Amino acid sequence: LSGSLAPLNMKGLVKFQDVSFAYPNHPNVQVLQGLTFTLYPGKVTALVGPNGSGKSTVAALLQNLYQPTGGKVLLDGEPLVQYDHHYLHTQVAAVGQEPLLFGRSFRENIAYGLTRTPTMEEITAVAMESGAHDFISGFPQGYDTEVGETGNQLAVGQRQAVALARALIRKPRLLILDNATSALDAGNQLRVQRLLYESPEWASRTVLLITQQLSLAERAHHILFLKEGSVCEQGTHLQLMERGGCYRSMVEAL
Ligand SMILES: Nc1ncnc2c1ncn2[C@@H]1O[C@H](COP(=O)(O)OP(=O)(O)OP(=O)(O)O)[C@@H](O)[C@H]1O
Numbered sequence: 001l002s003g004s005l006a007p008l009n010m011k012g013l014v015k016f017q018d019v020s021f022a023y024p025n026h027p028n029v030q031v032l033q034g035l036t037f038t039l040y041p042g043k044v045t046a047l048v049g050p051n052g053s054g055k056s057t058v059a060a061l062l063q064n065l066y067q068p069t070g071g072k073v074l075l076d077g078e079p080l081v082q083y084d085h086h087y088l089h090t091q092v093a094a095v096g097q098e099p100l101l102f103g104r105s106f107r108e109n110i111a112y113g114l115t116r117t118p119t120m121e122e123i124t125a126v127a128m129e130s131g132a133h134d135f136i137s138g139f140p141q142g143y144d145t146e147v148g149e150t151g152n153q154l155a156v157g158q159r160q161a162v163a164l165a166r167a168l169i170r171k172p173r174l175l176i177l178d179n180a181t182s183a184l185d186a187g188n189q190l191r192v193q194r195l196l197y198e199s200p201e202w203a204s205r206t207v208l209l210i211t212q213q214l215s216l217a218e219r220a221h222h223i224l225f226l227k228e229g230s231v232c233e234q235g236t237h238l239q240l241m242e243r244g245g246c247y248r249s250m251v252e253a254l
Pocket of ligand 1: 050
C-alpha cells in the first residue's frame with residue numbers, strides 16, 4: 001500500500017536495484033539504465049562523474065520525486081512509494097547546488113521541515129558548521145532577517161551554507177548532497193565533510209556526496225563513479241587508483 005510505512009526504527013540502508021530512468025517529458029531519451037548500488041549507514045558515499053552522467057537524476061529519484069521506469073529504489077528493503085511522504089521528508093534531507101531560500105527568514109530556512117522549535121544555540125551550532133553564522137549575523141535582524149531584505153543578492157556559497165544548516169539540524173538518516181558544497185569556501189568544504197566523516201552522530205547515518213571535485217570525493221568512505229547512466233566502478237580512493245579505469249583517468253587528467 002502506498003504511503004503506509006513510517007517505522008519506529010530507521011537504519012537508512014538505501015539500494016538502487018537495476019534502476020533505469022527517463023524523464024516523462026522525454027521518455028525516449030534514456031538517462032539511467034542498469035544502475036545498482038547500496039549506500040550503507042555510517043559511510044559517506046561519494047558519487048562522481050562527468051556532465052550528463054545522471055548524478056542529479058539519481059538524487060531526484062532518491063528523494064522520491066520520480067519513480068524509476070524500471071528496477072527498484074529501496075529504503076531498508078522497501079520501495080520509497082510505500083513510505084509516508086512527510087515521514088520520508090523528516091528522515092531524508094536533500095540539498096541542491098542552488099538551494100531555493102526565498103519566501104522566509106534565515107531561521108525558518110534552517111528550521112525547515114522540523115516539527116519542534118529549535119533554540120538559538122541549535123540554530124547557531126549548525127550554521128557555524130556550514131560557515132553561515134558570521135554573514136547571517138551581519139544582516140540587520142540576524143537569523144530573523146527575511147531573504148531578500150539583506151541589502152544585496154546572496155552568493156551561491158552563502159545560499160549553500162544556509163541550506164546545509166537546514167540539512168544538519170534535521171538529524172536525517174539519509175543526507176543527499178547534490179553538489180551542495182560546490183561554491184563553499186575550501187576550508188568550509190572540508191570542515192563539513194570532516195563532521196560527516198568523523199563525528200559519532202553521523203556514524204549511524206547515510207550520506208550521499210554527489211560532487212565533481214576530486215579533493216572532496218577522495219575523502220569519502222566509498223566512491224561510486226557514474227558513467228552513461230550507470231556505475232562504471234566503485235571502491236575506496238586508493239582501490240580505484242590501483243587498477244586504473246574511470247576514476248584514475250579523471251584524477252590523472254585533472
Ligand atoms: N527536468 C528534465 N527534463 C528533461 N531532461 C533532463 C531534466 N533534468 C535533467 N535532464 C537530462 O538528463 C541528463 C542527466 O542530467 P543530470 O543533471 O542528472 O546529470 P549530472 O551528472 O548531474 O550533470 P552535471 O554534473 O553537469 O549537473 C542530462 O543529459 C540532462 O539534459
